[PDB]
């Protein structure tokens, strides 16, 4: 197995996958680490049991799906892919807003709040999860305005959207 956490790339108390060489801190894995197979493995098994699941889909159909166990897993994995990027640190914990010339968002949102909501089964459809994730980056863009720091929200949103299209097999388009 790897000697560093797959998500944050640090050493420490690591739990090892039994079906692949990845390792994880307890609370870096999503769900929190519970023979054991990691979320990467579990996602791969879904694809292998249903190869047609990789044919292209419409985003509108994906968003209306109820959060059954396989969609719950795919959202957990998508959330984990965002935490895998180091720039997720800016969006992980609860933000506060006191900048001259700006007003904070009406509905603040952050990654650890989405993690908790997933863990507590608060989303009934994929749309709920995706709306909250996109809201993180939209709030950031609106608040920081012309500050170059706005770019961090564009960057991490791009990671979210690329992984969304991959994990839920969104039909490729020009
Ligand atoms: Cl922010
Ligand atoms: Zn970690
Ligand atoms: Zn694994």
Walk me through the structure.
With 174 residues, this protein is an all-alpha fold. The protein has 2 domains: 55 residues, Zinc/RING finger domain, C3HC4 (zinc finger) (Herpes Virus-1, 2-Layer Sandwich), CATH 3.30.40; 119 residues, Bromodomain-like (Histone Acetyltransferase, Chain A, Up-down Bundle), CATH 1.20.920. The protein is 47% helix and 2% strand. The chain has 7 helices and 2 strands, in the order ββααααααα. A two-stranded antiparallel sheet has the order 1-2. β1 and β2 form a beta hairpin. α3 packs antiparallel against α5. The longest helix has 19 residues. The chain is globular, with a radius of gyration of 17 Å. Chloride ion binds next to loops.
Summarize the helices and strands and which ones pair or pack.
Blueprint: E1 15-16, E2 23-24, H1 39-49, H2 59-63, H3 69-83, H4 89-92, H5 111-119, H6 126-144, H7 150-167
Antiparallel strand pairs: 1-2
Helix pairs in contact: 1-3, 3-5, 3-6, 3-7, 6-7
The structure holds chloride ion (CL) and zinc ion (ZN) (2 copies).
One zinc ion binds at residues 5, 7-8, 10, 25, 28.
């Amino acid at each position: 197995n790897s000697n560093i956490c797959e998500v944050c790339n640090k050493w420490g108390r690591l739990f090892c996958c039994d079906t692949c060489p990845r390792s994880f801190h307890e609370h870096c894995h999503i769900p929190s680490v519970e023979p054991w197979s990691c979320i990467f493995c579990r996602i791969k098994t879904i694809q292998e049991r249903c190869p047609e699941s990789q044919s292209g889909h419409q985003e509108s159909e994906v968003l209306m799906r109820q959060m059954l166990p396989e969609e719950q897993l795919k959202c957990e994995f998508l959330l984990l892919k965002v935490y895998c990027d180091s720039k997720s640190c800016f969006f992980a914990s609860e933000p506060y807003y006191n900048r001259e010339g700006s007003q904070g968002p009406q509905k603040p949102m952050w990654l650890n709040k989405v993690k908790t909501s997933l863990n507590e089964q608060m989303y009934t459809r994929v749309e709920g999860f995706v709306q909250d994730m996109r809201l993180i980056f939209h709030n950031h863009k609106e608040f920081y305005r012309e500050d170059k720091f706005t770019r961090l929200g564009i960057q991490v949103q791009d990671i979210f959207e690329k992984n969304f299209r991959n994990i839920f097999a969104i039909q490729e388009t020009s």
